[PDB]
């Protein structure tokens, strides 16, 4: 970020390593949880678009998050590009040009330009715009929080199948990639974590049956 | 927070509802958990002593925790008075005075003083000094946690053995002691505080049975 | 209002019913579906805050969505006022006032004021600033939940018709399908997907008995 | 609300949280019942069209109810524009203009115009004209009725007769009909939508039994 | 109240009948409910002790409450005479006398004196001070409540006796009747509105029985 | 701080521990009985807002009671800011200033500012203004209370022992009494007031048997 010396002249200092350390630790625990948005927002006030790219690099271990966010960055930059068909040079000769969406993204623009729009008067708040675009990407990211483990399903004393299947299906819904290992647990574990009446039923019905047939049979 | 605007203006700012909401949820969820500390650090950017006090009072509704932390400020203030041995005369009228441990803790200083020091020429950084002290104090709170007891966890007549094991396993994480104790407590007390019919099942099956088996068997 | 054409020439004009008509049908059918988003954008190009407000009004009976969007307005607004506070007092009344969050959102601004900002010198696009927050809120709604399945209104072990019909009717209205499909699902699912004790009763009673007679009968 | 300060100063003041919360608790219990009218009047003391709008906006979750009220405002506004003189040149330059029906509704006038008109030596006092229209709109909403009907209420197999009768007794007061008709409905539908084992007990009791007896009987 | 306009005229208007009718109506429905407090505040703006006294006289149908509020008013006025004892004459020559507590309670003060102090220079505002004392009284008044009736307290099929008798006795305590009638009512209704198994129990146990016995006989 | 003695003279002094020790013991014993209010009054004469905050911190332990107070104070404080907001300028720094509600409550002020107000031209009485908000809050708090009597801890006809020991034990800690009373209550009443199925077990076990014995027995 830029901060402001005693004469009032700005000074850039690349994002704080203390900030970096804090920011990685927020993503390690809370990348998909909304508390990431005020934590990201808090740590990005007066930041440049390049500090924000170092911030995005730091969120780059959550693969799911890095694809969604990088895509949102492309969408907002494309949108800016449809509304903004910028001139060849500056609109203010001697000053920084009109930013395109990628300049906002801090990718195509130099650090000096990002500091010029930031320091210059008339709401060109490149950090703050990029940060809202990023914040929209986070909103997409938190939509895909992940519960884990499907093995922890179990059944009550006299409880019928139809409820167990509701917990089972829900354990399986969150699952993804490589179905075959899943399927092999499904055929096994379905019968195995059932209560003894349901276990007898599930053993009996077999591979001929639909899980709706067993749920009728088990009410 | 104190924030900037272009060309020599430092602006005190209100703290975001998102940073507050988030800070509120953090103490609510992480009061004795190590994570309160980086969540605090990430939510204490630009913070004056006054912001930091506002943040604390809103969440400090637990007096044992607040006391310990406030005692840690008392330790650091005591160290502060060791850093600031006697001086001669007024420092410079219109520039703010020496900040002591109470000034850094925001009690003897007004908001305008707090500003004064943080906006000073190469600042004496009183919000950041109070922060250093609070991070050690919160660290103290998570180190000096109150546990909860294994002893209690036992199984009722209409209570399920699987549900009793969910409280046992969790109480066992929370129980203060080492792993050789935990394994030993598991082996002894899990079976021992079971309801007798359930207990009977676990003893019929005997000590080599998996907990995955014990918890399927007793319903 | 003024809008700037595809070439880039300024044109004055007003809203269309067909846009509104399109908005009631989408929001009735896709309120919690992400398809709402590009449909909202297609219907909000050249929109003022008041136009945005008419749109919202034309589907104002989805209070829950309206409240999610309002939390987003309020959140984003509080953030604006700390980040971009007005200049104090009526320093120059009668010409170009600064706006707050409530002005971007059009609750405190007249349409002339809204138009004033957007036909001012220096690109102040209050319509776009309010849309961007509305898109952020729309993303929050599409994020949270979506699926229904009318085929799965299967019962508990002894579970009565009056509980079943109640679930089935609520799910049949909430299930997005044509009314002819709804007549085919009414006609398929009712005797068939019923609790087996109930299904016995319902197979005796027959199509000569109404849902009320079924609900009384099946206790 | 407008309030006073000494010697000719009128001060605009923020709406009370205690009113907003009361207005919420009031609509939340009495939206369709007359008590919302005096409650509305008493908390609209010194209210402006913006204050009153704000109040309506905070409770404006029924689109049809909100629509009826806006139409009533429009009817009354139409009667206002019949009544308003067809004044040519400035009546009141350098002070507030002509207030139309949309100015009394606060739609097209700014708050300061609203303060202006209501705070000079009585000229046209817009809040009070707007309150008159709203009190009429609220009168329509309470006069108007349409939710619930008696026949929906039938009794379950594991449901007390007293739990069925509470739903019945309350429902019947909300059903539409003269009271002789309601009495006839009581005698008929109470026993007829009963659970068959309770229905048996009740028919054993016959039409001589008080309602105390019917609840005693059926346990 | 005193009322005022922005051209500069300030006059007294004594308390409105329409405000009296609205206040009476508030008290009839919400006397014992906090909404009486912002409704009071809103209808006593600029209200002198004399308007407020006129206002107070109307809650006389809740005698214990009006008496308690008046007794409080006397505690707080005597407390003002201790805290603010008056000079024998006026404190500044050719100016109005200090208010005593009794002058704040309006008992010894005319409307003109209440007018003079509200319209004085420095913070002494007799209406608002009298309102603080009354608000403390209002706090006592909301601490009251008003149940339905004893004759409807009865017990569900398998429902516990100990709770039933707790509901019966409190409702009988709230119920307006002479004590001998409550003594007879308790002995009659308690056993008679008991659930039938419990009813047959209470008749087995018999009328020599304590509630300690009655709760034992059915448990 | 400064206090005024019975001869009328102004005397400086500062707090006593005896007042604090008495205030803690007072809350611990009488929070649920109205005497806490006239004891609060006895212990809050001469108090500054910072004295008052000190008191509250010594009684910080009943978080629910302190919260209700604190909510009430935040409501009065919010109302104060609405009725009186500060001057826009900084007219006389360290001489006098407008106090906000939090400044009255000592949340945002230093002590020198509170004394500056209370020793100003017209004794601005921030300790007494804040003590009224505490006393009003204290009225609401004493209005909340009603749990009593270990001997009235009894069970329903089909109810669990473990849960019953929790209601019995927790009630027994909240009940001040003495220890001798408490074992006699435990050995008589735990066995007498048990659920019939539980009571058959407890009588069988005998009041001799330990609670671990009774919990193994009742499961």
Crossing angle of helices E63-83 and E49-56, rounded to 10°: 160
Cβ separation C139–A139 shorter than 8 A? yes
Kindly state the helix (H) or strand (E) to which residue E2 belongs, with its residue range.
strand E2-5
Look at the block and give the residue holding tokens 């490589």: A178
F160 closest CB neighbour out of B112, B154, B156: B156
Q: Going by CATH, does the domain composed of D150-217 fall within 3.65.10.10? A: no
Cβ separation A45–B41 shorter than 8 A? no
Q: Cβ–Cβ contacts within 10 Å for residue B174, how many?
A: 13
Look at residues A38, A107, A117 and name the one whose alpha carbon lies nearest to residue A70. A107
Q: What's the burial of E146, exposed, middle or buried (CB within 10 Å: 0-12/13-18/19+)?
A: exposed
* Residue of chain C with shortest Cα separation from A144: C143
CA angle A15, A18, A23 (to 5 degrees): 80
Rounded to the nearest angstrom, the minimum Cα separation between E9 and chain D is 6
Q: Which fold has domain B161-217?
A: 1.10.1200
Look at residues E149, A96, B29, E10 and name the one whose alpha carbon lies nearest to residue D121. E10
The tokens describing E212, both together, are 């300690």
State the count of interchain CB pairs (< 8 A) between D and F: 11
Chains meeting D at 3+ CB pairs closer than 8 A? C, E, F
| Chain C residues contacting A via beta carbons under 8 Å | 83, 122, 132, 135-136, 139-140, 143-144, 154-159, 195-196
Phi/psi region, residue C18 (left: phi>0; alpha: psi -120 to 50; beta: rest), is: alpha
CA angle C180, C186, C187 (to 5 degrees): 90
Give the integer Cα–Cα distance in Å for C167 and A58: 47
Could you say which DSSP state residue E61 is in? Answer: T
Look at residues E169, E139, E130, E122 and name the one whose alpha carbon lies nearest to residue E48. E130
Rounded to the nearest angstrom, the minimum Cα separation between E134 and chain F is 11
Asked if D161 contacts C167 with a C-beta cutoff of 8 angstroms, the reply is no
Rounded to the nearest angstrom, the minimum Cα separation between C179 and chain B is 44
Look at the block and give the residue holding tokens 């049979």: A217
Residue E3's DSSP bridge partners are E11
Cβ separation F75–D16 shorter than 8 A? no
Helix, strand, coil share (%) of chain B residues, nearest 5 = 60, 5, 40
Quote the radius of gyration of chain A (alpha carbons, Å).
Answer: 26
Give the integer Cα–Cα distance in Å for A19 and B38: 10
Question: What would the 3-class secondary structure string for chain C be?
Answer: CEEECCCCCEEECCCCHHHHHHHHHHHHHHCCCCCHHHHHHHCCCCCCHHHHHHHHHCCCCCHHHHHHHHHHHHHHHHHHHHHCCCCCCCCCCCCCCCCCHHHHCCCCCCHHHHHHHHHCCCCCCHHHHHHHHHHHHHHHHHHHCCCCCHHHCCCCCCCCHHHHHHHHHHHHHHCCCCHHHHHHHHHHHHHHCCCHHHHHHHHHHCCCCCHHHHHHHCC
Instruction: Give the homologous superfamily in CATH for domain E2-142.
Output: Human Immunodeficiency Virus Type 1 Capsid Protein (1.10.375.10)
| Chain E residues contacting F via beta carbons under 8 Å | 122-123, 132, 135-136, 139-140, 142-143, 158, 160-163, 215-216, 218-219
Q: Cβ–Cβ contacts within 10 Å for residue B55, how many?
A: 21
Cβ separation E5–D212 shorter than 8 A? no
Structural domain spans, chain D: 2-143, 150-217
| Chain F residues contacting B via beta carbons under 8 Å | 57, 60-61, 63, 66-67, 93, 107-108, 110, 113, 160-162, 215-216, 218-219
Kindly state the helix (H) or strand (E) to which residue F126 belongs, with its residue range.
helix F126-142
CA D112 to chain CA centroid, Å, is 28
Cβ separation E41–D16 shorter than 8 A? yes
Look at residues E41, E3, E35 and name the one whose alpha carbon lies nearest to residue E19. E41
Look at residues E88, D46, E90, E111 and name the one whose alpha carbon lies nearest to residue E119. E111
Q: Going by CATH, does the domain composed of B2-143 fall within 1.10.375.10? A: yes
Q: Do chains C and E touch (3 or more CB pairs under 8 A)?
A: no
Quote the radius of gyration of chain F (alpha carbons, Å).
Answer: 25
Q: What's the burial of F23, exposed, middle or buried (CB within 10 Å: 0-12/13-18/19+)?
A: buried
Which residues of chain A does B19 touch, with a Cβ-Cβ cutoff of 8 Å? 38, 41-42
* Residue of chain E with shortest Cα separation from F189: E212
Asked if C123 contacts C28 with a C-beta cutoff of 8 angstroms, the reply is no
Strands D2-5 and F2-4: unpaired
- DSSP helix/strand/coil, F4: strand
Asked if B136 contacts B76 with a C-beta cutoff of 8 angstroms, the reply is yes
The tokens describing F63, both together, are 């978080």
The tokens describing E19, both together, are 């405000």
Cβ separation C78–B16 shorter than 8 A? yes
The tokens describing C122, both together, are 């220096």
Q: What's the burial of F132, exposed, middle or buried (CB within 10 Å: 0-12/13-18/19+)?
A: middle
* Residue of chain C with shortest Cα separation from B15: C82
For the domain spanning C2-144, the CATH number is 1.10.375.10
Look at residues A79, A67, A77, A74 and name the one whose alpha carbon lies nearest to residue A144. A67
Cβ separation B42–A26 shorter than 8 A? yes
Question: Which of B103, B108, B155, B157 is the best substitution to test chain F (most F C-beta atoms within 10 A)?
Answer: B157
Question: Which of F139, F149, F189 is the best substitution to test chain E (most E C-beta atoms within 10 A)?
Answer: F139
Rounded to the nearest angstrom, the minimum Cα separation between D43 and chain F is 15
Chains meeting F at 3+ CB pairs closer than 8 A? B, D, E
Asked if D194 contacts D156 with a C-beta cutoff of 8 angstroms, the reply is no
Kindly state the helix (H) or strand (E) to which residue B201 belongs, with its residue range.
helix B196-205
Cα-based distances in Å from D32 to B139, D35, D148: 55, 9, 13
Give the integer Cα–Cα distance in Å for A112 and A120: 12
Cβ separation D196–C212 shorter than 8 A? no
Quote the radius of gyration of chain B (alpha carbons, Å).
Answer: 26
Residue F53 phi/psi, 5° resolution? Answer: -60, -40
Q: Provide the sign of the torsion angle of the four alpha carbons E194, E200, E202, E207, taken in this order.
A: positive
Look at residues B107, B101, B190 and name the one whose alpha carbon lies nearest to residue B153. B190
What is the length of chain E?
A: 219
Rounded to the nearest angstrom, the minimum Cα separation between E209 and chain D is 23
Q: What's the burial of D74, exposed, middle or buried (CB within 10 Å: 0-12/13-18/19+)?
A: middle
Asked if C196 contacts A219 with a C-beta cutoff of 8 angstroms, the reply is yes
Q: What's the burial of E145, exposed, middle or buried (CB within 10 Å: 0-12/13-18/19+)?
A: exposed
Residue A23 phi/psi, 5° resolution? Answer: -65, -45
Q: Cβ–Cβ contacts within 10 Å for residue F62, how many?
A: 15
Kindly state the helix (H) or strand (E) to which residue A198 belongs, with its residue range.
helix A196-205
Rounded to the nearest angstrom, the minimum Cα separation between C107 and chain B is 21
Could you say which DSSP state residue A193 is in? Answer: T
Could you say which DSSP state residue F87 is in? Answer: P
Look at the block and give the residue holding tokens 């002249």: A9
The tokens describing A136, both together, are 């929209």
Contacts of D12 (CB under 8 A, 6+ apart): D1, D2, D3, D48, D111, D115
């Amino acid at each position: 970020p830029i901060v402001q010396n005693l004469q009032g002249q700005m000074v850039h200092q690349a994002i704080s390593p203390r900030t970096l350390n804090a920011w990685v630790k927020v993503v390690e625990e809370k990348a998909f949880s909304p508390e990431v948005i005020p934590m990201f927002s808090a740590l990005s006030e007066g930041a440049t678009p390049q500090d924000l790219n170092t911030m995005l690099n730091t969120v780059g271990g959550h693969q799911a998050a890095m694809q969604m966010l990088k895509e949102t960055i492309n969408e907002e930059a494309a949108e800016w590009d449809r509304l903004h068909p910028v001139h060849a040079g500056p609109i203010a000769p001697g000053q920084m040009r009109e930013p395109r969406g990628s300049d906002i993204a801090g990718t195509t623009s130099t650090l000096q330009e990002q500091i010029g729009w930031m320091t210059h008067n008339p709401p060109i708040p490149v950090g703050e715009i990029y940060k809202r675009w990023i914040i929209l990407g986070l909103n997409k990211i938190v939509r895909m929080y992940s519960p884990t483990s499907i093995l922890d399903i179990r059944q009550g004393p006299k409880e019928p199948f139809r409820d167990y299947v509701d917990r089972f299906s829900k354990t399986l819904r969150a699952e993804q990639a490589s179905q075959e290992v899943k399927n092999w647990m499904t055929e096994t574990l379905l019968v195995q974590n059932a209560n003894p009446d349901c276990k007898t039923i599930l053993k009996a019905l077999g591979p001929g049956a639909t899980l709706e047939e067993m749920m009728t049979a088990c009410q």
